[PDB]
A and B are shown apart, each in its own frame.
Chain A
Amino acid sequence: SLARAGKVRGQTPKVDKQEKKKKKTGRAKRRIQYNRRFVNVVKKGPNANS
């Protein structure tokens, strides 16, 4: 039919992103990744919403 090409992507309510703070990159990101997973402890996943 080809009359519905781009149907759901056009019907989705356009919601833009949010002005969020920057993120550490390189060694600083690994540092945050380390002390959060190994140092700061005390099972759920890193993104577990339950």
Chain B
Amino acid sequence: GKCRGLRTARKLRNHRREQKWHDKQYKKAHLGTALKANPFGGASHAKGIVLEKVGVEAKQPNSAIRKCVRVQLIKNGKKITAFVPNDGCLNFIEENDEVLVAGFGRKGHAVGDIPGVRFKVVKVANVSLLALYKGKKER
């Protein structure tokens, strides 16, 4: 059990500090890993250049083709697979364009039936993808 001694503040402080590393949520934010492997490097959004136009298939029991894009970031040159959210917005995307990608819902976790996509496109050609979908800023 616990040591309730009046001079056990050192034993309690050392035990609690060590057991916090067995927490998955704590060891992820207080280590070099999970941040060096993070392509964004701890940022909210990121800009990149579109390399290809790949379509990943949704996992079971779903059946569809997710319109994704192979993007290479600028600040570190890493290759990520963003997601073009809305309907037909992949046509607004052209290869070798400047797109502002961001996270996808869950932090560093694949959202929905998409196999390994954990990012999504926010802007393209320095204009927002949402305005292109609503008939504004025709680009």
Check A-B contact in the complex, CB < 8 A.
Answer: yes
Residues of A in contact with B (beta carbons under 8 Å apart): 1-2, 4-10
Residues of B in contact with A (beta carbons under 8 Å apart): 53, 55, 65, 67, 87-91
**CB proximity of B117 to chain A, nearest CB, Å:** 15
Cα of A8 to Cα of B86 in the assembled complex, Å? 12
Q: Is the CB of B88 within 8 A of A1?
A: no
Q: Is the CB of B87 within 8 A of A1?
A: no
Q: Is the CB of A6 within 8 A of B88?
A: yes
Chain B residues contacting A6 (CB-CB under 8 Å) are 87-91
Chain B residues contacting A4 (CB-CB under 8 Å) are 65
Chain A residues contacting B55 (CB-CB under 8 Å) are 1-2
Chain A residues contacting B91 (CB-CB under 8 Å) are 5-6
